[PDB]
Amino acid sequence: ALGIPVMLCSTAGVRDFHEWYRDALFVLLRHLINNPSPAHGYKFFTNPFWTRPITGAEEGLFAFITLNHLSRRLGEDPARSMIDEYGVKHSRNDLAGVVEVG
Amino acid sequence: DTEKRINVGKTHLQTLRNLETRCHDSLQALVVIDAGSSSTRTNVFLAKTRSCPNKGRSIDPDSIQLIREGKRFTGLRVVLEEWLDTYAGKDWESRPVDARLLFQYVPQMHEGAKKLMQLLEEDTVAILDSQLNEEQKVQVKALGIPVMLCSTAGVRDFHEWYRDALFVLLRHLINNPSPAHGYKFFTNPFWTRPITGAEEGLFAFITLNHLSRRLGEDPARSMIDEYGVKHSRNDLAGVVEVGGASAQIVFPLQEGTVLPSSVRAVNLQRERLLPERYPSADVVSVSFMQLGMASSAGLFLKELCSNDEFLQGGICSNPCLFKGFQQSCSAGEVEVRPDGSASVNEDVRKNRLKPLATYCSVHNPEISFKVTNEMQCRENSIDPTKPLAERMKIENCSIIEGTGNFDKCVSQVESILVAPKLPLPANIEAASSGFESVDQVFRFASSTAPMFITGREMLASIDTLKDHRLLRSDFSGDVEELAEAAREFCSSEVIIRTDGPVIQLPNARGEQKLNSLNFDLCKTMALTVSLLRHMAAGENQPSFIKWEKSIAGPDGKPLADLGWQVGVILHHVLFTEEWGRTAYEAGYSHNLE
Amino acid sequence: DTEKRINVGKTHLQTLRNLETRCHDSLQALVVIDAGSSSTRTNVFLAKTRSCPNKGRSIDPDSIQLIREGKRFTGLRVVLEEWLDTYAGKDWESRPVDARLLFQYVPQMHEGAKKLMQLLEEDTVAILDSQLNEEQKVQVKALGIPVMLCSTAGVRDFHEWYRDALFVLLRHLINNPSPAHGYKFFTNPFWTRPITGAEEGLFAFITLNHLSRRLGEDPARSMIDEYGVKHSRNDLAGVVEVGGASAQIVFPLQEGTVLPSSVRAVNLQRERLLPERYPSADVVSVSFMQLGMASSAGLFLKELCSNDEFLQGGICSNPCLFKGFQQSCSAGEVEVRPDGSASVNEDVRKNRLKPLATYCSVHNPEISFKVTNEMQCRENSIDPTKPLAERMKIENCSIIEGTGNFDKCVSQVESILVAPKLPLPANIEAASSGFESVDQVFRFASSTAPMFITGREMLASIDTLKDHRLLRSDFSGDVEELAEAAREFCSSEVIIRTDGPVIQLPNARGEQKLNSLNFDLCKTMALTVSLLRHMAAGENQPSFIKWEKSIAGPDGKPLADLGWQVGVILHHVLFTEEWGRTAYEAGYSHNLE
Ligand SMILES: Nc1ncnc2c1ncn2[C@@H]1O[C@H](COP(=O)(O)OP(=O)(O)NP(=O)(O)O)[C@@H](O)[C@H]1O
Ligand SMILES: Nc1ncnc2c1ncn2[C@@H]1O[C@H](COP(=O)(O)OP(=O)(O)NP(=O)(O)O)[C@@H](O)[C@H]1O
Ligand SMILES: [Mg+2]
Ligand SMILES: [Mg+2]
Ligand SMILES: [Mg+2]
């Protein structure tokens, strides 16, 4: 009933890919997601903001967000964050960094 | 050695980097002008503003504190009545007046309002100059001063277009202050406007719950259940406010208290009184005209001394007045002189029956076209056909004598003020919410929420009995405990001594000096008994009934006084985006040429 | 008779009712400080603010007009270099310097920046006082003055932390102005910050299209198709800006022009440059270091006089210099004296090869750790191992002689500046967008959008030929029409006459006085030919190429000058909610204690 947001992100595989080809493939990939089999009932959909080639910095930044979210270091609630006397929100625990070797 | 030397410069950049990233607090002044029945007075407040990068500027609701309530200047009713006396002719109350013709005298109304506004402006500046330091003055002058002038029961019953036309002129006078003082006062039709009786009551409820720390959106005062609904940690308290011309009865509805279709309750979030982030509540808010101290005093004397049971050979026997007390038969201001005598001011302006007699006129369209309002006046002894002087006059009466019977006083306050046959004049707003009278409030709507009583005389009724040891230091609000204490006090004799008139309590209990404030306090004592009787009669009874003047803050010192003032501020300031647009984005700079 | 009398008072209320309901316009000053390579100058703008009830305060983008561009004070590079000369020792360019140790000299950097900021503040106030009237001064002082100081190519290549630390100090100096003048200047890290080469170009594009009425969100400049997409009515024009140290090439991509994966185009809405309500466009924005007038002049002399084809027995033959012209062999500032001689200033600060030689140092981490940047310096004849003086020195050269061959000058500007083997030093930003050089821009990305050329000398190259009747009054921008006109002009002899040095045109065409501005204009003429050659080589060719100084407004008078200034204002002001929060809600009041 709610629909299934689909996020297809390409990494180092096509990051160095020459000419237009990769970007043209992504326009075709989104149309294929937006047009799924009606038989299964699962309403898959996408947009150029969700399905797109992600940069190396973005790939790393999202990996940082995953680590800190799961380990409960990142949060906007009083359990994981704190507001000082100058109205600035700081995290209660130190944010951890990541080294991912794909 | 040099490690500590390079750290000073590193700290120098960090301090500067913190200044730009952090929020900055600045002091701002807020003005609420209570344009009530009795008088028009300024209320100067101070609040802490917080400006954050990409977050704009907002007011800390908990930082809102009253610095001073200014001098009591001429009421809006007097200003408009003086204008009609000179531009529509003297004794316009007894003659048919053409409202269309008064439009040529609008610049003349501006001068009348200018005189009052210049006094209020001068007083506000005098308060700010005396309380603020030079550093505080700079922050206050730079941010601008939002002004909120709201009219209550004084001009609520005012006939024709005059009241609304005055408000357009009042806003222009605020928006154009003296540049000499430096204080940048500004207003808009959303801040400066006549407030309804329900609104007056609702703001008084918001003030009480804010100051007592019952209403809040933070985890300290509120709680989110497993279904994402914010509830307040402490029970929201209701209020009973008794002014000069009107009384407000406000209380929130606890649980799923099902009400009749005719009875109209107000949800604070749905009716845009409080933001969505605040905990929701369905509140019953009703205001009754002719119930305030000054107006109820005049109406009681008119109805009691018109009844054959109390008027005999020109001598009206009043059960709400002490034994031995004597006064002239008129609703005019009573001054208790040092020789025991009661001086009654016979001036039309100083007469307490004037606002009611001015409303009850066959020349007022609310009477001539509406028969229902005419019968409401006639039942309260006012003949709308008769001239103004004849309306305020207590016919076939010369002297009012005090009988001192408390039980007879309660019985009369009940039939006249609390539960009359027809509703008291100028109460269409109350009737539209489903309440024709005070008795109907607790009959149709009841709550288990604690009640708070406000009003100079309402407190005085309790304190006087507490002082003479007739009531316990700890008083929960027992109806018959109060009625027994007041019955012994009201039966007291008045002895004219060398020092002056003294209230001699029976069975040698004690004594106190008789003055212009306590001579008729037994009428208010009876009003409190009757009010608590209906609260105890209702399906749901309050947890406790408290009598308070002002709420003590966290430091021990009171933050602000009880009333609609703080409530009207919070009604605007709590809407973060809307407040920032009107107070900071538009600001006093909007008034510039 | 009385019908007209009552109507005056009726109008009196309507006028007052209109004032509160209507919007009010107030004048506000905006300051953009161009902290460029050559100098640091203020740009005072004036805009019309509009405050509406419940709608807040906003700026009319079309009302934005430049009143004056202030005096040209010391550049940020000079301020930081003077600080290093006194706190890291003299000739720090040839010695290894410990950056950590410089942290103890941060308060000393504040004093150096204070001296420059006080000059800029004094100049800004002098402009405002001279142009604004008393009524205008009040509105300007009350609203506050947003200040936007942005650094460009001058400190873009600046080594270590120094540049960013200076910006933290610069913001504190703006936020703390002299209270005596009354003008309330304020800033934030979003307004005052070093801008990138792409941003510098993108803002210059926004300025051009705004002033020429090509970019707008209204129906006059835009159109909504049947699929709810806003398109601009007129084609968006591109810009070519040539400054002191860098050149920007900006153009929007028309239609579905497919680009390679390496080439990075910027969508104005997606990258938050313009609001969603504005028509969308994919724009190619690239900036090239060592391409600006001053930096390209120094680099050309270094590379040309290092080639064996041009240097013989200490005499460097320059094809971009006129026949008979003679000067010393150094990149220092050339002053054409009245006796025909060329005075070359040998001061390190005044030398045009200094910013390049300071960047190309083995002590700079961008060279010592990055071999690629070292080879970029070595190919442009700068040895990073050698001392500062030896780097700027044109080895085995004494005198530069002018040959006046235009075709040879074009061929050299092409191989050195336009299309070199390796990219010109400090161009990592350009390379990351997919453009190592100027020739690669139109090779990988091309547009049918009209181009606009900006820069003192770029215009002078066209105007000089137009004045001597070598080019038509109406000049579309033909490449070979320009090359023929410039070839005849550059071959001109220099005759030292009693009046001074005169440029004698061949076949008795005409004559003009030779000065410090036009002596090397043939290098810029060749640059324009090479630039137009690549534009004509690209898959898509511009509709027309125009040379403009400033854009004429609707009244005929120009609103503002072309550059990144108006663009940076519109980048902030057009985000209605965000601008109102920072400029009006927070304002100068944020700086208060
Ligand atoms: N200085 C005073 N402070 C407090 N109460 C006063 C004062 N002077 C008189 N009173 C008493 O309090 C009543 C007026 O109370 P007040 O709080 O001013 O309401 P109001 O604004 O005049 N009435 P309303 O129009 O219904 O809001 C008078 O009728 C007096 O009994
Ligand atoms: N007063 C002046 N007005 C305009 N151009 C000037 C002026 N003085 C010198 N110029 C010339 O224009 C160049 C500087 O142009 P300018 O617009 O100030 O860019 P810039 O800000 O110094 N460079 P950049 O850091 O890349 O933004 C100099 O190299 C001169 O050739
Ligand atoms: Mg991976
Ligand atoms: Mg009141
Ligand atoms: Mg520039």
Write the DSSP string, C15-50.
HHHHHHHS-EEEEEEEEEEEE-SS-EEEEEEEEEEE
Distance spanning both ends of chain C, measured CA to CA: 62
Query: Which residues from chain B sit within 8 angstroms of residue A88, using beta carbons?
Result: 21-23
- Look at the domain B196-561 and name its fold: Nucleotidyltransferase; domain 5 (3.30.420)
| Residue ranges of chain B that CATH labels 3.30.420.540 | 196-561
Cβ-defined contacts of C27-30 (< 8 Å, 24+): C27/C136, C27/C139, C27/C140, C27/C143, C28/C59, C28/C139, C28/C140, C28/C143, C28/C144, C28/C145, C29/C128, C29/C132, C29/C140, C29/C143, C29/C145, C29/C183, C30/C64, C30/C145, C30/C146, C30/C148, C30/C569
| Residues B177/B212, Cβ–Cβ less than 8 Å | no
Query: Which residues is C69 bridged to in the sheet?
Result: C43
Residues 36-55 (C) with a CB less than 8 A from some CB of B: 51-55
Distance spanning both ends of chain B, measured CA to CA: 62
Nearest Cα to C265, choosing from A59, A23, A12?
Answer: A23
Query: Which residues is C52 bridged to in the sheet?
Result: C56
Ligand nearest to the CA of B156: 1
Phi-psi region of B477 (alpha: psi -120 to 50; beta: other; left: phi over 0): left
DSSP 8-state symbol, C529: H
- In terms of residues, how long is chain B? 593
| Residue ranges of chain B that CATH labels 3.30.420.530 | 1-195+562-593
Tokens of C380: 């442009």
Q: Is the CB of C155 under 6 A from ligand 2?
A: no
Phi, psi of B451 (to 5 degrees): -105, 145
Q: Does domain C1-195+562-593 have CATH number 3.40.50.800?
A: no
Burial label for B230, CB within 10 Å (0-12, 13-18, 19+), is: middle
Give the position, in ligand 2's atom list, of the atom nearest the Cα of C294: 29
Query: Which residues is C47 bridged to in the sheet?
Result: C28
| Residues C226/C263, Cβ–Cβ less than 8 Å | no
Q: Which residues fall within 8 angstroms of residue C53, CB to CB, at 6 or more apart?
A: B188, B189, B190, B582, B586, C20, C21, C23
Query: Which residues from chain B sit within 8 angstroms of residue C134, using beta carbons?
Result: none
Q: Is the CB of B298 under 6 A from ligand 1?
A: no
Burial label for B383, CB within 10 Å (0-12, 13-18, 19+), is: middle
Q: How far is CA C217 from CA C213, C228, C273, C559, in A?
A: 11, 13, 14, 19
CB contact under 8 A, B168 and C8: no
CA angle C168, C172, C177 (to 5 degrees): 150
Q: Is the CB of C204 under 6 A from ligand 2?
A: no
Query: Which residues is B65 bridged to in the sheet?
Result: B46
Q: Which residues fall within 8 angstroms of residue B367, CB to CB, at 6 or more apart?
A: B359, B360, B361, B373, B374, B377, B384
Amino acid at C275: P
- Closest-CA distance, B512 to chain C, in angstroms, reads 54
Q: Is the CB of C153 under 6 A from ligand 2?
A: yes
CB contact under 8 A, C53 and B168: no
Nearest Cα to A28, choosing from A5, A8, A1, A4?
Answer: A8
C-alpha span between B294 and B523 (Å, rounded): 12
Phi, psi of C196 (to 5 degrees): -75, 165
Q: How far is CA B458 from CA B69, B218, B565, in A?
A: 20, 34, 19
Q: Which residues fall within 8 angstroms of residue C140, CB to CB, at 6 or more apart?
A: C27, C28, C29, C128, C132, C183
C-alpha span between C324 and C494 (Å, rounded): 5
CA of A11 to the centre of ligand 3 (A): 7
Strands (E), B414-475: 451-454
Query: Which residues is B240 bridged to in the sheet?
Result: B249, B453
Helix (H) or strand (E) holding C240: strand C238-242
Amino acid at B213: R
Tokens of B166: 């005055």
* C390 tagged catalytic: no
Nearest Cα to C271, choosing from C202, C188, C191?
Answer: C202
Q: How many CB pairs under 8 A join A and B?
A: 11
Q: Does A23 touch chain C if contact means CB atoms closer than 8 Å?
A: yes
CA of C244 to the centre of ligand 2 (A): 5
Phi, psi of B290 (to 5 degrees): 70, 15
Q: Is the CB of B311 under 6 A from ligand 1?
A: no
C-alpha span between B577 and C350 (Å, rounded): 53
Lookup result for tokens 């409530």 = B567
Query: Which residues from chain C sit within 8 angstroms of residue A18, using beta carbons?
Result: 260-261
Helix (H) or strand (E) holding B364: none
Chains in contact with B via at least 3 Cβ–Cβ pairs below 8 Å = A, C
C-alpha span between B523 and B411 (Å, rounded): 11
- Closest-CA distance, C446 to chain A, in angstroms, reads 15
CA of B485 to the centre of ligand 4 (A): 30
Give the position, in ligand 2's atom list, of the atom nearest the Cα of C246: 26
Count CB neighbours of C554 within 10 A: 8
Q: Is the CB of C477 under 6 A from ligand 2?
A: no
Nearest Cα to A52, choosing from A1, A97, A14?
Answer: A14
- Count H helices and E strands in chain A, helices first: 2, 4
Q: Is the CB of B153 under 6 A from ligand 1?
A: yes
C-alpha span between C185 and C176 (Å, rounded): 8
Whole-number CA gyration radius for chain B: 26
Q: How far is CA B523 from CA B399, B404, B496, C117, C522, in A?
A: 18, 10, 22, 74, 104
Could you tell me the resolution of this structure in angstroms? 3.0
Q: Which residues fall within 8 angstroms of residue B411, CB to CB, at 6 or more apart?
A: none
- Closest-CA distance, C371 to chain B, in angstroms, reads 31
CA of B265 to the centre of ligand 1 (A): 27
Strand B493-497 and strand B500-504: the pairing is antiparallel
C-alpha span between C174 and B19 (Å, rounded): 13
C-alpha span between C518 and C539 (Å, rounded): 34
Concatenate the DSSP letters of all residues of C155-223 into one string.
HHT--SSHHHHHHHHHHHHHHS--TTS---EE--TTTSSPPPHHHHHHHHHHHHHHHTT---SSTTTEE
Strand B145-151 and strand B24-35: the pairing is parallel
Phi, psi of B459 (to 5 degrees): -75, -45
| Residues B318/B403, Cβ–Cβ less than 8 Å | yes
Nearest Cα to C486, choosing from C457, C453, C521?
Answer: C521
Query: Which residues is C50 bridged to in the sheet?
Result: C25, C58
Distance spanning both ends of chain A, measured CA to CA: 36
- Nearest Cα residue to atom 1 of ligand 2: C72
> Which of C138, C584, C591 shows the shortest C-beta gap to B584?
C584
Catalytic residue among C81, C93, C121, C200: C200
Amino acid at C287: S
The gap from C-alpha B255 to its chain's centroid, in whole angstroms, comes to 29
Q: How far is CA C415 from CA C61, C352, C391, in A?
A: 43, 20, 21
Candidates B23, B54, B60: best to mutate against A (most CBs of A within 10 A) is: B23
Count CB neighbours of A57 within 10 A: 8
Tokens of B96: 């048919």
Tokens of B155: 């001009």
Give the position, in ligand 2's atom list, of the atom nearest the Cα of C293: 29
Number of Cα atoms under 13 Å in the Cβ half of residue C593: 5
- Nearest Cα residue to atom 31 of ligand 2: C293
Tokens of C230: 């806003």
Query: Which residues from chain C sit within 8 angstroms of residue A21, using beta carbons?
Result: 261
C-alpha span between B247 and B578 (Å, rounded): 31
Nearest Cα to B151, choosing from B186, B196, B116, B110?
Answer: B196
Nearest Cα to B358, choosing from B113, B92, B99?
Answer: B92
Q: Which residues surround ligand 3, an ion (CB under 5 A)?
A: A 11, 102
Strands (E), B228-368: 230-232, 238-242, 246-252, 266-267, 282-289, 311-312, 315-318, 326-328, 334-336, 342-344
**Coil, helix or strand at residue C391:** helix
Method used to determine the 3D structure: X-ray
C-alpha span between C404 and C514 (Å, rounded): 14
DSSP 8-state symbol, C71: -
Residue of A nearest to B18 (CA): A86
| Residues C291/C438, Cβ–Cβ less than 8 Å | yes
Nearest Cα to B380, choosing from B400, B405, B403, B355?
Answer: B355
**Coil, helix or strand at residue C84:** helix
Give me the torsion for CA of B555, B561, B562, B564, rounded to 10°: -120
